[PDB]
Short mmCIF file of N, CA, C and O and ligand atoms in Angstrom, two decimals:
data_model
loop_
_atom_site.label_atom_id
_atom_site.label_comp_id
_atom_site.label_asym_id
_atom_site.label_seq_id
_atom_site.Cartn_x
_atom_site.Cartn_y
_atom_site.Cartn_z
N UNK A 1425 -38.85 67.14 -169.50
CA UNK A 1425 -37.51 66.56 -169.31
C UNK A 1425 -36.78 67.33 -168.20
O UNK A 1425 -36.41 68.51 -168.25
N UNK A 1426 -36.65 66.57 -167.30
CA UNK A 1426 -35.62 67.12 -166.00
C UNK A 1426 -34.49 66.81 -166.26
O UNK A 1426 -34.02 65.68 -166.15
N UNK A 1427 -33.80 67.99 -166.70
CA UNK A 1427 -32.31 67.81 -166.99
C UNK A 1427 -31.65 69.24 -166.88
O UNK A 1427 -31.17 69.54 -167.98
N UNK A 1428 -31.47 70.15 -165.98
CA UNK A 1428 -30.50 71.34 -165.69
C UNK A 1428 -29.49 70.93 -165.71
O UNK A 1428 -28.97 71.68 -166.54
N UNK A 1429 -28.56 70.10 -165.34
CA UNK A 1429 -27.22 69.66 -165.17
C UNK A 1429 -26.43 69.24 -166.48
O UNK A 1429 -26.95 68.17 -166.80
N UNK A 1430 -25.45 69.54 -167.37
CA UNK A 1430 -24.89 68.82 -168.18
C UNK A 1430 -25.72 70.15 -169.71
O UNK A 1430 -26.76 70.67 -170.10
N UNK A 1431 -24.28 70.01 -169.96
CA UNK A 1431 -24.84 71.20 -171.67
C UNK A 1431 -25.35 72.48 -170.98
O UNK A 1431 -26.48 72.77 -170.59
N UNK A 1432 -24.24 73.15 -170.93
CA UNK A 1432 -24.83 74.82 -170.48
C UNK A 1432 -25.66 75.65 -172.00
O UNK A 1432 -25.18 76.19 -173.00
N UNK A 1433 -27.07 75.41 -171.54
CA UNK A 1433 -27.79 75.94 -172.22
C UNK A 1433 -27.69 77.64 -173.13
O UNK A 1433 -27.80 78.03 -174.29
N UNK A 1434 -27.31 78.45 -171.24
CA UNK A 1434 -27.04 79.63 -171.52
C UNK A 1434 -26.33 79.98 -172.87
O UNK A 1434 -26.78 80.63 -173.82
N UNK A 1435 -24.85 79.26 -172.70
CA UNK A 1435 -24.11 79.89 -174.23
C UNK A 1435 -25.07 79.23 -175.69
O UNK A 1435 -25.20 79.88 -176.72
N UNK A 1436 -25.51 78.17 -175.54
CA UNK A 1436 -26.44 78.33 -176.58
C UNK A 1436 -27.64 78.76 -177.16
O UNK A 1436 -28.08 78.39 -178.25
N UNK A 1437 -28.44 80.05 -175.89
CA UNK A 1437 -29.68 80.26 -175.94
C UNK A 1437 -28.86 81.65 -176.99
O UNK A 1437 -29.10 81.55 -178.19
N UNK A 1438 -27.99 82.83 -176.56
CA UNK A 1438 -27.43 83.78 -176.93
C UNK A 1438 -26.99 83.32 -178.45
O UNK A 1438 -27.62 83.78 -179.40
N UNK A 1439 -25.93 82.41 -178.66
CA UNK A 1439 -25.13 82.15 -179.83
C UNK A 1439 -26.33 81.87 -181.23
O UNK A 1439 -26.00 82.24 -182.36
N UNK A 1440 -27.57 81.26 -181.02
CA UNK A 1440 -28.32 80.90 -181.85
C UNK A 1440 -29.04 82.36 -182.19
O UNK A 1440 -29.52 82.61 -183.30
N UNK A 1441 -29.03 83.32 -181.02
CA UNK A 1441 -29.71 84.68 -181.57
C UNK A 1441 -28.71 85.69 -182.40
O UNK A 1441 -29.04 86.55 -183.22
N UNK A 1442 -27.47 85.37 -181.98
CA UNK A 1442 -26.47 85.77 -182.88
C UNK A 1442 -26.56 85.58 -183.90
O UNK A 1442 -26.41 86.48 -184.73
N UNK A 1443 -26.84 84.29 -184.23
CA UNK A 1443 -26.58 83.56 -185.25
C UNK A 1443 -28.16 83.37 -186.97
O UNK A 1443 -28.32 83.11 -188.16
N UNK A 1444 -28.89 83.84 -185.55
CA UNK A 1444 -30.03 83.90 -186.44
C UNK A 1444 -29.71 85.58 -187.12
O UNK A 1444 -29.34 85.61 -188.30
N UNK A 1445 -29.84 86.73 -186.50
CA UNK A 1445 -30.22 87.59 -186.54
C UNK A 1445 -28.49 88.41 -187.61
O UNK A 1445 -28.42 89.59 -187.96
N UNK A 1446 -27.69 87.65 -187.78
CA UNK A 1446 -26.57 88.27 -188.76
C UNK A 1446 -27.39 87.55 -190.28
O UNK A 1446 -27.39 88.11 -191.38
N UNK A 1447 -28.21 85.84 -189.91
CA UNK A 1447 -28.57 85.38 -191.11
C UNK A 1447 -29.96 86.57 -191.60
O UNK A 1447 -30.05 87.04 -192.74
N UNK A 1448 -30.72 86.81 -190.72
CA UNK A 1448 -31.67 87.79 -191.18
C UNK A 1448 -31.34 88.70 -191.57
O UNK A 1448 -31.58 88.65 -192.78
N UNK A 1449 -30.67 90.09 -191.17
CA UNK A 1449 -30.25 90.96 -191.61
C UNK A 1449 -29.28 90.42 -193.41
O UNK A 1449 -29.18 91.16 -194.39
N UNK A 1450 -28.94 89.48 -193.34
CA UNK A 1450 -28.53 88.89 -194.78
C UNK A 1450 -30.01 88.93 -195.36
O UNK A 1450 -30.22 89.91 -196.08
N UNK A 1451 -31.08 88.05 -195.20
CA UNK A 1451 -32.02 87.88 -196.16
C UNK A 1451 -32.81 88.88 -195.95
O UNK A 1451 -33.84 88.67 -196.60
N UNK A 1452 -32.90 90.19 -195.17
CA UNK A 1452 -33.73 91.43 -194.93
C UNK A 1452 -32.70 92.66 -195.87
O UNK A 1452 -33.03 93.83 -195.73
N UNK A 1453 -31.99 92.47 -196.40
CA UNK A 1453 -31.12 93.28 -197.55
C UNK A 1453 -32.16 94.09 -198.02
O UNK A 1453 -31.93 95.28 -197.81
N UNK A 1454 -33.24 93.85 -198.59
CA UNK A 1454 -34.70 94.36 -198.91
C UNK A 1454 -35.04 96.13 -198.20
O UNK A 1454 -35.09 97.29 -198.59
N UNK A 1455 -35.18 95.36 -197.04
CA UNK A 1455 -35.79 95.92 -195.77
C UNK A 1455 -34.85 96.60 -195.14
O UNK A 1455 -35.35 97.60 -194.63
N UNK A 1456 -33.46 96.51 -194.89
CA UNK A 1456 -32.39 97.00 -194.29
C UNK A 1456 -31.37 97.79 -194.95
O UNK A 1456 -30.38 97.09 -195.15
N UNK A 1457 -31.27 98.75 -195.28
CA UNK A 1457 -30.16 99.44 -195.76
C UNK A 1457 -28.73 99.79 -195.23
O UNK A 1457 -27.60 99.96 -195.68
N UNK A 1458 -29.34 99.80 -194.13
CA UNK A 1458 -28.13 100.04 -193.05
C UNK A 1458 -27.48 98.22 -192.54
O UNK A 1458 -28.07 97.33 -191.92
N UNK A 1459 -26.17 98.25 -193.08
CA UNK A 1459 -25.40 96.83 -192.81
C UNK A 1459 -24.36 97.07 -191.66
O UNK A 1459 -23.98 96.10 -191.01
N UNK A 1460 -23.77 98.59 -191.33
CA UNK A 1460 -22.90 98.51 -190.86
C UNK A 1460 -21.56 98.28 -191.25
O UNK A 1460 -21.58 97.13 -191.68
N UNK A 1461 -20.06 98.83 -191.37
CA UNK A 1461 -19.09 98.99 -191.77
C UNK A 1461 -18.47 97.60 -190.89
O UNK A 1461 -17.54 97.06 -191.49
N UNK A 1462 -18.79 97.02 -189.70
CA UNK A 1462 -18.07 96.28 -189.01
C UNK A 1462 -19.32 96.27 -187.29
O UNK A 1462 -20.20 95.41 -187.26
N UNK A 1463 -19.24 97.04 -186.36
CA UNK A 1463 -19.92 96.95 -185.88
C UNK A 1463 -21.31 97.84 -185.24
O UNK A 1463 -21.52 99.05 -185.38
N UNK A 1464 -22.23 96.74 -184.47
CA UNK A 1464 -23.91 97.82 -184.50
C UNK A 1464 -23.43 99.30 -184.23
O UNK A 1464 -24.08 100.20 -184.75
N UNK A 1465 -22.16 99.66 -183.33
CA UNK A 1465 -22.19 101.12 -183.15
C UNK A 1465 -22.72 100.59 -181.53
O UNK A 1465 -22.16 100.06 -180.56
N UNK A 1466 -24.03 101.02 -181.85
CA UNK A 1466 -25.10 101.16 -180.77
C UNK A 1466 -25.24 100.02 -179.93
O UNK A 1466 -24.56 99.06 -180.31
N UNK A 1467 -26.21 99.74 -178.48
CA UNK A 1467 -26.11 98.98 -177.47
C UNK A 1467 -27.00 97.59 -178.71
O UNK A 1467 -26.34 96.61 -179.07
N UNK A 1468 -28.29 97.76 -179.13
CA UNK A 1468 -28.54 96.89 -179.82
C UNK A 1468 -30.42 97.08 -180.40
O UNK A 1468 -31.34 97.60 -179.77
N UNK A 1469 -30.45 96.59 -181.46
CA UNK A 1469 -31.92 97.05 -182.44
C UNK A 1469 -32.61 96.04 -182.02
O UNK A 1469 -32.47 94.84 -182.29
N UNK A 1470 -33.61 96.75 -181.11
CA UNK A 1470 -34.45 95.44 -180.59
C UNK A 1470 -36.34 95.73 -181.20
O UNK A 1470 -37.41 96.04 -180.68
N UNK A 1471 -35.77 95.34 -182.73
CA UNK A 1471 -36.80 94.96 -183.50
C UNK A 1471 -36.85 93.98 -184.55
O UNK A 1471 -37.37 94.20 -185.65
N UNK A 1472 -36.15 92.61 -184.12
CA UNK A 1472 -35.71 91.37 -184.85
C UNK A 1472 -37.08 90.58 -184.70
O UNK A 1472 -37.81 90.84 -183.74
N UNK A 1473 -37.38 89.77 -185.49
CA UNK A 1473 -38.25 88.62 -185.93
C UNK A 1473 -39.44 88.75 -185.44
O UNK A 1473 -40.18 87.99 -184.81
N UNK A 1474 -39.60 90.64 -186.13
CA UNK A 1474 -41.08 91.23 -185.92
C UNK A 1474 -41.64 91.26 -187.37
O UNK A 1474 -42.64 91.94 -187.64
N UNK A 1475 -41.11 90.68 -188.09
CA UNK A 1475 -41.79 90.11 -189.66
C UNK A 1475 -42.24 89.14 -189.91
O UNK A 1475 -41.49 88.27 -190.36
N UNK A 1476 -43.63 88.89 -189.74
CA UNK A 1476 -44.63 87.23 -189.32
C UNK A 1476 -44.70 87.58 -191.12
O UNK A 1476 -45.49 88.47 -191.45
N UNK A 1477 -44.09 87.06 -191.97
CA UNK A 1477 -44.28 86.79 -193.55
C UNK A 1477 -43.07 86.14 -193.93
O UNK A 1477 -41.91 86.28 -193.55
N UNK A 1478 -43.71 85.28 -194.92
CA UNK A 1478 -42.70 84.27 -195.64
C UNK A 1478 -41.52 85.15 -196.67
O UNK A 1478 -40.29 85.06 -196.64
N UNK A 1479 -42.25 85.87 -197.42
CA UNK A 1479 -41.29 86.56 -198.47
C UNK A 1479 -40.68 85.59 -199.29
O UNK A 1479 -40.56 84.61 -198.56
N UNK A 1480 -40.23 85.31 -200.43
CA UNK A 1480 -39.42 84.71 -201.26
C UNK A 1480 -38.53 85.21 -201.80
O UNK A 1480 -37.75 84.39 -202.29
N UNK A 1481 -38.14 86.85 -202.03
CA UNK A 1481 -36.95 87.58 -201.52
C UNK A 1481 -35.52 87.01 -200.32
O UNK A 1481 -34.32 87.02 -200.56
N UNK A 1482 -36.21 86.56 -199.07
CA UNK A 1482 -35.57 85.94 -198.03
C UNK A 1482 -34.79 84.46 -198.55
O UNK A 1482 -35.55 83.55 -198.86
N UNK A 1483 -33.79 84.29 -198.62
CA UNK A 1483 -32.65 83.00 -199.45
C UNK A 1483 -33.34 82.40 -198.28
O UNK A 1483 -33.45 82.87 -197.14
N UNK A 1484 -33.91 81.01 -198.86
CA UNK A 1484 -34.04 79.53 -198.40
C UNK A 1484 -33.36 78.45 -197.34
O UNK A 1484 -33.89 77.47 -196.81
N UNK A 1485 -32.28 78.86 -197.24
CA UNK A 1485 -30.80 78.75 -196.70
C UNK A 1485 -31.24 79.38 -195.62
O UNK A 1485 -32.09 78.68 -195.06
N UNK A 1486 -31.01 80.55 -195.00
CA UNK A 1486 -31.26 81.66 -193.82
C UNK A 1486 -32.86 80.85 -193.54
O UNK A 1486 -33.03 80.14 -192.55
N UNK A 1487 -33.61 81.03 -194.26
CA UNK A 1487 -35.27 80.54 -193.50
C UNK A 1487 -35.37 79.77 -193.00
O UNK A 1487 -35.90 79.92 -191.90
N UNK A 1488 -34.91 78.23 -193.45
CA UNK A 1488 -34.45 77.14 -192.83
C UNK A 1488 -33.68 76.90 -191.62
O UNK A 1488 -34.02 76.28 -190.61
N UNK A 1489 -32.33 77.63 -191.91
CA UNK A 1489 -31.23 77.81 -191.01
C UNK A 1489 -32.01 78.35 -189.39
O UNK A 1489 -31.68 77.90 -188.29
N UNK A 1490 -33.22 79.54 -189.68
CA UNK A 1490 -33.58 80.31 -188.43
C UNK A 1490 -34.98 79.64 -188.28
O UNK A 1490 -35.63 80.30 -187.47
N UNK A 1491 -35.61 78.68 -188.69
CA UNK A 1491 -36.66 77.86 -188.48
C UNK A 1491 -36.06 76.87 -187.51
O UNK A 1491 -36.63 76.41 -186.52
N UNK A 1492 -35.03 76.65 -187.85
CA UNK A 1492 -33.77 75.47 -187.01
C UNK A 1492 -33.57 76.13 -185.58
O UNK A 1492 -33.87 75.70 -184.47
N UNK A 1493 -32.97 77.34 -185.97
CA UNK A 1493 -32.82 78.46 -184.63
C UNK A 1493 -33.87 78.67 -183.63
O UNK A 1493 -33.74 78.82 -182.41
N UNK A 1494 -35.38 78.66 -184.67
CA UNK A 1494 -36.33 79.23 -183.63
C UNK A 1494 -36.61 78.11 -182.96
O UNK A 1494 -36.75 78.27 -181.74
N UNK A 1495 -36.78 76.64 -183.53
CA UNK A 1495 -36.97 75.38 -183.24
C UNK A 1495 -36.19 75.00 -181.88
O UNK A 1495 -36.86 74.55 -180.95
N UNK A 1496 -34.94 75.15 -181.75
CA UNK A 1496 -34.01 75.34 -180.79
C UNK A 1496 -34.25 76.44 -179.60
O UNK A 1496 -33.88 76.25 -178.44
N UNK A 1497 -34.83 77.46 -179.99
CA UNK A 1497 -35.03 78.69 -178.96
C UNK A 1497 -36.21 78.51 -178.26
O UNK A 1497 -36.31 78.99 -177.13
N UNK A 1498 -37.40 77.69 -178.92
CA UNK A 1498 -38.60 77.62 -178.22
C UNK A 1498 -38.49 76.43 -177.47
O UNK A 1498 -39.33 76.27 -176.59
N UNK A 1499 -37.73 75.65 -177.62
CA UNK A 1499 -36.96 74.40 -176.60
C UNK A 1499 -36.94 75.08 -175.59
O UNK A 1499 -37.63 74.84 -174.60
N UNK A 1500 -36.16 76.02 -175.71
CA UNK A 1500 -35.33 76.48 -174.42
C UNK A 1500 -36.37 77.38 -173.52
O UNK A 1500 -36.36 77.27 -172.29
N UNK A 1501 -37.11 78.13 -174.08
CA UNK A 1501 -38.77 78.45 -173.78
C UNK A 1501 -39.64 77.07 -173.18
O UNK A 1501 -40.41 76.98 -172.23
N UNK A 1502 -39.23 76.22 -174.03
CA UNK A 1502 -40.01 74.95 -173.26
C UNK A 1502 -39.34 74.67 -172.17
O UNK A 1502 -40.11 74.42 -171.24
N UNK A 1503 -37.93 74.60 -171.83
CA UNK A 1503 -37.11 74.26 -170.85
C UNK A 1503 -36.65 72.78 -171.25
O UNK A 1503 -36.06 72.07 -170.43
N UNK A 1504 -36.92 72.37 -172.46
CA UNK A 1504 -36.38 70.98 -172.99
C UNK A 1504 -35.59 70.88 -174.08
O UNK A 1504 -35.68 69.93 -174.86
N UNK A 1505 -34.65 72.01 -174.26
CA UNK A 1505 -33.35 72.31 -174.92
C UNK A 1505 -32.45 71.10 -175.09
O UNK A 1505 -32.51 70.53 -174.00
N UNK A 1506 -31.88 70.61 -175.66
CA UNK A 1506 -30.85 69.33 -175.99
C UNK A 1506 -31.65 68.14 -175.61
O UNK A 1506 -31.38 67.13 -174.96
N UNK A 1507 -33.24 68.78 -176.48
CA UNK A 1507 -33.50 66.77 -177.02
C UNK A 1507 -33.89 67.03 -178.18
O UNK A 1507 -34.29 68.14 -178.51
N UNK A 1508 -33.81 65.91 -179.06
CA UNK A 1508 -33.84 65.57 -180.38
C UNK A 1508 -35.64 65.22 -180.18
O UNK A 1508 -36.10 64.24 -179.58
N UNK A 1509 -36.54 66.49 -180.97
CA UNK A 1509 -37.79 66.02 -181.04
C UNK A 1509 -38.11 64.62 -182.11
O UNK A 1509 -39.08 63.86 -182.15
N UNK A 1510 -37.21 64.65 -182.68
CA UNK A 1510 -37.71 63.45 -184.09
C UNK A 1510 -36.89 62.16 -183.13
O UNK A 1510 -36.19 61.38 -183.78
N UNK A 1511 -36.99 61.99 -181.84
CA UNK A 1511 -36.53 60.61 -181.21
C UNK A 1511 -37.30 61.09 -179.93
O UNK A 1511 -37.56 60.07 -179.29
N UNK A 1512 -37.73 62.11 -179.32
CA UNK A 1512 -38.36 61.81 -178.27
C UNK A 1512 -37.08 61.37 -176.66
O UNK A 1512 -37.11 60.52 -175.78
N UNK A 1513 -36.07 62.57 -177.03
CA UNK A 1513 -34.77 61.64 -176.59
C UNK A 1513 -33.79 62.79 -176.53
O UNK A 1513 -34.00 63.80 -177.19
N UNK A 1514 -32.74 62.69 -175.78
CA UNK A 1514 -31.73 63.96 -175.43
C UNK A 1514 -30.71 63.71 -176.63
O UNK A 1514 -30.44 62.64 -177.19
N UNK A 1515 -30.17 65.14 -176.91
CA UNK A 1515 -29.15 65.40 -177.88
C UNK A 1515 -27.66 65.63 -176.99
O UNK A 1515 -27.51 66.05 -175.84
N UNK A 1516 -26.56 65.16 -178.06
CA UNK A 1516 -25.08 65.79 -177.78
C UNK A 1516 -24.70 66.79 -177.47
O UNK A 1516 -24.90 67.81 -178.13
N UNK A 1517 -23.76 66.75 -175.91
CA UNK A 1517 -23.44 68.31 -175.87
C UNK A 1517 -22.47 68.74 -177.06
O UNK A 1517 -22.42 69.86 -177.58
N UNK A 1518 -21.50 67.34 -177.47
CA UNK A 1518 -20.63 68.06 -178.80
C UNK A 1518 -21.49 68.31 -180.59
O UNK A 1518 -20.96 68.84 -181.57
N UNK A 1519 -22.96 67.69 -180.51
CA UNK A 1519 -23.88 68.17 -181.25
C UNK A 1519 -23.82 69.70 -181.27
O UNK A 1519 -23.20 70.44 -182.03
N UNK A 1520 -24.80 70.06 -180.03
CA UNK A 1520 -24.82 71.63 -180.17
C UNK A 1520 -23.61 72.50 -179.59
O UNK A 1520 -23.98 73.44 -178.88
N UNK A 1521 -22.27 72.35 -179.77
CA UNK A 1521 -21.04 73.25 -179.16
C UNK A 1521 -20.84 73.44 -180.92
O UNK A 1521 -20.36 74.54 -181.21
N UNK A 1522 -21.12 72.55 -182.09
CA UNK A 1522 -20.84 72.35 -183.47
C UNK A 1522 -22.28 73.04 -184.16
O UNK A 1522 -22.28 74.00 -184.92
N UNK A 1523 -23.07 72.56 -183.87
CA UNK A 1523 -24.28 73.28 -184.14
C UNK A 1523 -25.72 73.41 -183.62
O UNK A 1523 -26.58 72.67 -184.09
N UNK A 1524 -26.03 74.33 -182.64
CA UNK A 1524 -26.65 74.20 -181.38
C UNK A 1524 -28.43 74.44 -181.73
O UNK A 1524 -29.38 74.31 -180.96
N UNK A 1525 -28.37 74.99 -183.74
CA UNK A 1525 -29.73 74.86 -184.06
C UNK A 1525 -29.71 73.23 -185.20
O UNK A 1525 -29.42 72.99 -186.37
N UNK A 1526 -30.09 72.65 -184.32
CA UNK A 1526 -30.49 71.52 -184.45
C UNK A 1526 -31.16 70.87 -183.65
O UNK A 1526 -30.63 70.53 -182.59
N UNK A 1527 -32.87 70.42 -184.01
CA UNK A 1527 -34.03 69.57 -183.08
C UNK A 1527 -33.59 68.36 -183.25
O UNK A 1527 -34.34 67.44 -182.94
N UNK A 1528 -32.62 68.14 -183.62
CA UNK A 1528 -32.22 66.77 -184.28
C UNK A 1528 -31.36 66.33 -184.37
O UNK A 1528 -30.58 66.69 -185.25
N UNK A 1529 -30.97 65.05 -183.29
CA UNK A 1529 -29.67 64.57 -183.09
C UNK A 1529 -29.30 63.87 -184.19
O UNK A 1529 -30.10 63.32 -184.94
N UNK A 1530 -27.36 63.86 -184.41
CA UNK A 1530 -26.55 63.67 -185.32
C UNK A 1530 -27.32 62.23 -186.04
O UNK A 1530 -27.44 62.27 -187.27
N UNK A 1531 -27.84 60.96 -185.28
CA UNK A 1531 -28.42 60.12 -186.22
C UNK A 1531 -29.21 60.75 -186.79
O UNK A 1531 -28.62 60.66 -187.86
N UNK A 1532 -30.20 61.43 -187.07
CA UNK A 1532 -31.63 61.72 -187.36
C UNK A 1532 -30.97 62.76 -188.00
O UNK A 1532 -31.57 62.76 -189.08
N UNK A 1533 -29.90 63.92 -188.08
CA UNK A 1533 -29.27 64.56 -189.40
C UNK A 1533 -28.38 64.25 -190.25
O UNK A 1533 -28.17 64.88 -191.29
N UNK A 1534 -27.57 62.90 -189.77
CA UNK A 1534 -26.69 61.78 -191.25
C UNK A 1534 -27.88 61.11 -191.91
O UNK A 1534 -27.97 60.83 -193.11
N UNK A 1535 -28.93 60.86 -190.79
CA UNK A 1535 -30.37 59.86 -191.65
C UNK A 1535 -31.38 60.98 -192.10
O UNK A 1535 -32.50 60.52 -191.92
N UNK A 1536 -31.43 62.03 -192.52
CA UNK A 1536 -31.77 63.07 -193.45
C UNK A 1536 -31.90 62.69 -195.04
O UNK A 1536 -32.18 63.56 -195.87
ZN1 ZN B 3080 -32.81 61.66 -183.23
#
């Protein structure tokens, strides 16, 4: 899909790693002792989503939520970020400004 122009990718490649990695550190409670009072302190822990295991410890909610995230991030690895794979077809820029891990445009998540 040739499409650079329209939906700045950038703020959504960052916001979804944000977004994954506050939900992990939630379902890595296990694994993480250190939560932080407010913020990392430090520049940043660059040893995130180096745990290839399912766990059932990890809430269902977050796994999903960052399956959505990674789904969205390897788009953007593909360079075909804002299309809806379950249509074969481009997604809303006001889709992802609302929620930017989603493979799946607003028909195909009300028709869920
Ligand atoms: Zn769709």
């Amino acid at each position: 899909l040739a499409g650079g122009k329209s939906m700045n990718v950038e703020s959504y490649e960052k916001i979804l790693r944000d977004r994954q990695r506050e939900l992990y550190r939630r379902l890595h409670k296990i694994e993480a002792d250190f939560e932080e009072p407010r913020n990392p302190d430090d520049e940043d822990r660059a040893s995130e989503r180096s745990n290839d295991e399912v766990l059932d410890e990890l809430g269902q909610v977050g796994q999903d939520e960052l399956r959505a995230i990674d789904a969205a991030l390897a788009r953007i690895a593909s360079g075909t970020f804002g299309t809806c794979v379950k249509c074969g077809k481009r997604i809303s820029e006001d889709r992802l400004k609302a929620v930017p891990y989603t493979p799946f445009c607003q028909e195909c998540a009300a028709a869920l």
